[PDB]
C-alpha cells in the first residue's frame, strides 16, 4: 500500500532573531508633496513591526489661521517582482533546462548632469544631491511610481506615471514632469486634493460615448427606414448602465470586480502594492500675543501671531510578515481642506420652470453638469458652459466652503492671509493640473514664504522597528558545514 | 540628556528680522547623582571624577549600502552566507564623491550589518551643502574631504 | 528611550571538563632546604 516516492529534505535549518532597529531622519519640504521618509529591503519570512514618531514645525504664521493643515502618513509593501520582470530569472528560475546562464544584474539609474538637485525624489530616498557621475539601483524609484499608480493617481483626469519593468538602465532627471520623471527620481509627485463637491466631478455623464438610439438616413416621401426594436432598446439601456457604473466606481480591475460582481479581490493577487497602515491628523497652532509696545507703522500691542508645533505618534504603522523579496516604503503628505470664493452656488440659477426644482420623481435621472459659474463666475458666455459632471441634485447634498467680504482675495486690501481659500487667475478647467494640491494658498499665510525658498515644513521623524529576521543573532565568521 | 526650553518671540515683526512668533531656545538642566562613589579603600589612591558631553551622530553625505547590491544573486542576503568573513564598508557609504574612491574601503564591519542598522540621516534643505541651509536645526556631520577611519 | 549601542557577542562557547591528574615524584635532600616538589601551568 506504501512505496517510496521522493519528498522534501525539509532543507537546512534557518536561523532567526529579533532585532531592534532605530532610525531618525530630518526633512524639509512643502505642502502637497508626497515625500518618501523611509525605505527598507525585506527578505522572505521577515516579520516587521514599526512605530513612528513625528514632530512637525511649519513656518511661523503671520496670524493664527482660521484653517487647518492635515498630515497623512502611509506605509506600503512593494515586491521586487512586480517592479522588475527578471527577478525570478535573477534567483535562477530558468525557461530552459538546468541552470540559468546569463542573468542580467539589477538595473541602474544614472545621476543627471551635475547630480540630482535638492528636494528631488532621489534627495529624499537618501541619494546625495549635487554629486555627478554616480549610479544606483533603480528598483526603489520604480517602486515609488508603482505606489502612485496603484493608489494616488486619479485615473479620470491624468495618465499613469511611466513605469519600466525591463532590465535596461535608466537616466535620472531633475524635471518636474509628473508623468515621465517620477521613476527618474525628479521632483516628487503632488497629491490630489481631497474629495469634495468640485474635486469629485467627472469628464462626462458616463465613461464612454453617450448611448443613443439608431437613426438611418436612407431615402428613395421616404420608403422603408425600418425602426428600433424593443430588443435593441434593452441593449442600449444596459450599455448606459454599464458605462455609468464604470464612471462612479473606477475602472481599475480591482475596482471593476467590486462594482460589477460585488467581490473583494486581494491586492497581491492582482500585482498591486500592498497597503500596510496609515494615520491622519491635523496640526496644532499656538497663538502668541504681542507684548512689545505699539510703534508707528507697526503692529499694535496685543497683536496675535502664531507658531505650530505638533507631535504625532504612529504605533503599529507596519505589522506583518513577508513571503517574498520586497521593499517597504513609508510616505508622508500634508494637505488642507478647500474653500471657494469665486463661484455662485447652483441653486441661485434654478427656476426657469418647475422642472428645475427638485422633485422625488426626478430623483433617478442622469448625471447633471456643474456649470463654470459655480466654480468661477466671469459674467460672460463661459458661465453656462460645463466644468464637469456630478450626480443629480448633488448641490442639495453639499454646501462648499466659502469666504465673503474683505476676507476674499480679490479685495484691494485683503485679509486672505487669514485663510487657505483658492484663488484663480483664469477659469479653472477640470484637469490633472487643477486637481493637484496647491502650496501657494498656504503660502500667503506664512511670515517667510516658500516663493522665497523657505521650506514650508521642518519635520523630525523617529522610527523604531522590531524586526524578526532570518539571520543569526550575531554574524560571526566561520561555517557550520563544509 | 539635557532639557531644551523653547521661547516664542513676543516682539513685533521688524523688516530684516525674525517675525513675531519665532522660536528660540535655552537649555537648563539639573542632574542628580546619588551614590556616585560608595566603597572602602585598602591603599593610597586618588579619586578622579570626570564629565563629558556628547551627542548622537547623523550622516548626510553617504548612500546606504543596499543601493549598490544586485550585481548577481550572491550580493543579496541569504541564510547560507550568514557566517562569512567581515565585509568592507565602502567610502561611498560615508561620503560619495562620484570618483574612483567610492568603491575603496573605509573600514570593516560584520557581514550583512547594514541590514541590522539604518544610520541617521538628513535630506532636503536641512543638509549642510545647500546654499541656503537649515543645518542650524541639527548636529549632523559635515565633511570637507573624504574621512578616513582614524583617530 | 532605547537605541542601538554595541555590546558583547558573548563570544564562543568554551568547553569544560574535569580531569584527574595523578603524579608521583621521589626526592632526596637535606634539612633546611626549600625544595620545589610540584609545578603546573594554570
Amino acid at each position: 500500500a506504501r512505496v517510496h516516492d521522493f519528498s522534501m529534505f525539509k532543507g537546512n535549518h534557518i536561523p532567526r532573531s529579533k532585532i531592534h532597529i532605530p532610525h531618525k531622519t530630518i526633512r524639509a519640504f512643502n505642502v502637497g508633496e508626497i515625500i518618501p521618509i523611509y525605505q527598507t529591503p525585506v527578505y522572505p519570512g521577515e516579520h516587521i513591526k514599526m512605530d513612528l514618531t513625528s514632530l512637525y514645525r511649519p513656518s511661523t504664521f503671520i496670524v493664527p489661521p482660521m484653517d487647518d493643515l492635515i498630515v497623512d502618513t502611509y506605509a506600503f509593501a512593494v515586491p521586487w517582482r512586480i517592479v522588475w520582470k527578471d527577478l525570478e530569472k535573477f534567483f535562477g528560475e530558468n525557461s530552459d533546462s538546468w541552470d540559468v546562464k546569463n542573468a542580467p544584474p539589477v538595473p541602474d539609474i544614472v545621476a543627471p548632469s551635475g547630480g540630482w538637485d535638492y528636494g528631488t525624489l532621489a534627495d529624499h530616498f537618501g541619494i546625495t544631491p549635487k554629486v555627478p557621475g554616480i549610479r544606483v539601483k533603480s528598483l526603489r524609484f520604480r517602486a515609488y511610481a508603482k505606489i502612485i499608480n496603484d493608489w494616488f493617481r486619479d485615473q479620470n483626469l491624468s495618465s499613469e506615471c511611466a513605469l519600466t519593468l525591463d532590465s535596461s538602465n535608466s537616466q535620472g532627471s531633475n524635471g518636474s514632469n509628473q508623468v515621465t520623471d517620477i521613476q527618474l527620481g525628479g521632483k516628487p509627485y503632488i497629491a490630489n486634493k481631497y474629495h469634495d463637491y468640485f474635486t469629485s466631478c467627472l469628464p462626462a455623464p458616463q465613461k464612454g460615448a453617450p448611448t443613443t438610439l439608431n437613426v438611418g438616413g436612407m431615402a428613395p416621401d421616404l420608403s422603408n427606414a425600418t425602426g428600433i426594436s424593443i430588443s435593441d432598446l434593452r441593449l442600449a439601456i444596459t450599455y448606459q448602465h454599464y458605462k455609468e457604473m464604470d464612471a462612479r466606481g473606477g475602472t481599475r480591475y480591482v475596482e471593476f470586480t467590486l462594482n460589477h460582481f460585488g467581490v473583494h479581490t486581494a491586492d497581491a493577487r492582482l500585482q498591486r502594492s500592498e497597503f500596510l497602515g496609515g494615520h491622519s491628523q491635523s496640526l496644532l497652532v499656538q497663538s502668541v500675543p504681542q507684548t512689545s509696545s505699539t510703534v508707528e507703522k507697526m503692529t499694535p500691542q496685543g497683536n496675535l501671531a502664531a507658531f505650530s508645533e505638533t507631535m504625532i505618534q504612529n504605533n503599529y504603522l507596519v505589522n506583518k510578515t513577508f513571503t517574498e523579496h520586497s521593499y517597504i516604503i513609508v510616505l508622508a503628505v500634508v494637505r488642507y481642506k478647500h474653500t471657494y470664493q469665486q463661484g455662485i452656488e447652483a441653486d441661485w440659477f434654478r427656476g426657469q420652470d418647475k422642472f428645475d426644482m427638485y422633485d422625488p420623481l426626478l430623483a433617478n435621472i442622469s448625471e447633471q453638469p456643474v456649470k463654470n459659474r459655480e466654480i468661477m463666475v466671469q459674467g460672460n458666455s463661459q458661465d453656462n458652459e460645463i466644468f464637469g459632471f456630478q450626480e443629480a441634485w448633488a448641490d442639495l447634498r453639499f454646501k462648499p466652503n466659502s469666504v465673503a467680504g474683505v476676507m476674499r482675495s480679490s479685495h484691494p486690501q485683503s485679509l486672505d492671509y487669514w485663510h487657505f481659500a483658492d484663488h484663480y487667475a483664469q477659469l479653472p478647467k477640470l484637469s490633472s493640473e487643477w486637481l493637484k494640491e496647491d502650496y501657494k494658498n498656504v503660502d500667503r499665510t506664512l511670515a517667510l514664504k516658500a516663493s522665497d525658498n523657505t521650506p514650508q515644513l521642518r519635520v523630525d521623524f523617529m522610527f523604531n522597528t522590531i524586526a524578526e529576521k532570518p539571520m543569526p543573532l550575531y554574524s560571526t565568521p566561520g561555517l557550520r558545514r563544509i | 540628556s539635557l532639557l531644551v526650553q523653547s521661547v516664542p518671540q513676543t516682539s513685533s515683526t521688524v523688516e530684516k528680522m525674525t517675525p513675531q512668533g519665532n522660536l528660540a531656545a535655552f537649555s537648563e538642566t539639573m542632574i542628580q547623582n546619588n551614590y556616585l562613589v560608595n566603597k572602602t579603600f585598602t591603599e593610597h589612591s586618588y579619586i578622579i571624577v570626570l564629565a563629558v558631553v556628547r551627542y548622537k551622530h547623523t550622516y548626510q553625505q553617504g548612500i546606504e549600502a543596499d543601493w549598490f547590491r544586485g550585481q548577481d544573486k550572491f550580493d543579496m542576503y541569504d541564510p547560507l552566507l550568514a557566517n562569512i568573513s567581515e565585509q568592507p564598508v565602502k567610502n561611498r557609504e560615508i561620503m560619495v564623491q562620484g570618483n574612483s574612491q567610492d568603491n575603496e574601503i573605509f573600514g570593516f564591519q560584520e557581514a550583512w550589518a547594514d541590514l541590522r542598522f539604518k544610520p541617521n540621516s538628513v535630506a532636503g534643505v536641512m543638509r549642510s551643502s545647500h546654499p541656503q541651509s537649515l543645518d542650524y536645526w541639527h548636529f549632523a556631520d559635515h565633511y570637507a574631504q573624504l574621512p578616513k577611519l582614524s583617530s | 528611550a532605547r537605541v542601538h549601542d554595541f555590546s558583547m557577542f558573548k563570544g564562543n562557547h568554551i568547553p569544560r571538563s574535569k580531569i584527574h591528574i595523578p603524579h608521583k615524584t621521589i626526592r632526596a635532600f637535606n634539612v633546611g632546604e626549600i625544595i620545589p616538589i610540584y609545578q603546573t601551568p594554570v
Binding site: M462 | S1 | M8
Partner: peptide, 30 residues
Amino acid sequence: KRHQWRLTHSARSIKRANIMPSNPRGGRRF
C-alpha cells in the same frame, strides 16, 4: 493629549541610565 510644555524639541527621547563597564565591538571604550 495635545497641549504640552515648552520642552519638546525632537521626535526621539533618551532615557537616563546608570553606566556599567561593557565590552562592545572592538574593546572597551566609554
